[PDB]
Amino acid sequence: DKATIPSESPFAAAEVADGAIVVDIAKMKYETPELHVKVGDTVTWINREAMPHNVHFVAGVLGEAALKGPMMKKEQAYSLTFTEAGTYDYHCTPHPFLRGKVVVE
Ligand SMILES: [Cl-]
Ligand SMILES: [Cu+2]
Ligand SMILES: [Zn+2]
Numbered sequence: 001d002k003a004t005i006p007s008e009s010p011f012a013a014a015e016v017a018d019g020a021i022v023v024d025i026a027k028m029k030y031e032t033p034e035l036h037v038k039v040g041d042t043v044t045w046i047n048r049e050a051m052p053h054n055v056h057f058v059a060g061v062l063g064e065a066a067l068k069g070p071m072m073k074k075e076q077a078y079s080l081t082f083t084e085a086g087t088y089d090y091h092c093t094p095h096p097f098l099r100g101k102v103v104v105e
Contacts, residue, residue, distance in 0.1 A: 001063035030100040047072035
């Protein structure tokens with residue numbers, strides 16, 4: 001696969017370090033819709049609102065299987081580490097028009 005999962009379940013956003021690579025979700029937007037990172041970088045999504053959100057990479061994107069992330073409640077977070085250069089689109093399962101992209105060089 002082209003990424004690994006530090007934590008299979010969501011965790012408390014307060015645990016994320018300042019200066020960690022963070023994508024906020026709010027007002028039905030990934031606050032950084034095209035994120036540029038390097039191989040080995042760990043990306044953390046944080047849900048800032050009461051509507052639950054996830055990140056969903058369809059089959060083909062990070063491997064032959066889809067990576068459907070767990071639903072994050074308000075102030076919950078979820079990380080992925082990108083291990084291979086490429087460009088990876090994702091969306092939120094229940095809200096397919098909430099979408100983003102990670103560019104890994
Ligand atoms: Cl499916
Ligand atoms: Cu959503
Ligand atoms: Zn809904």
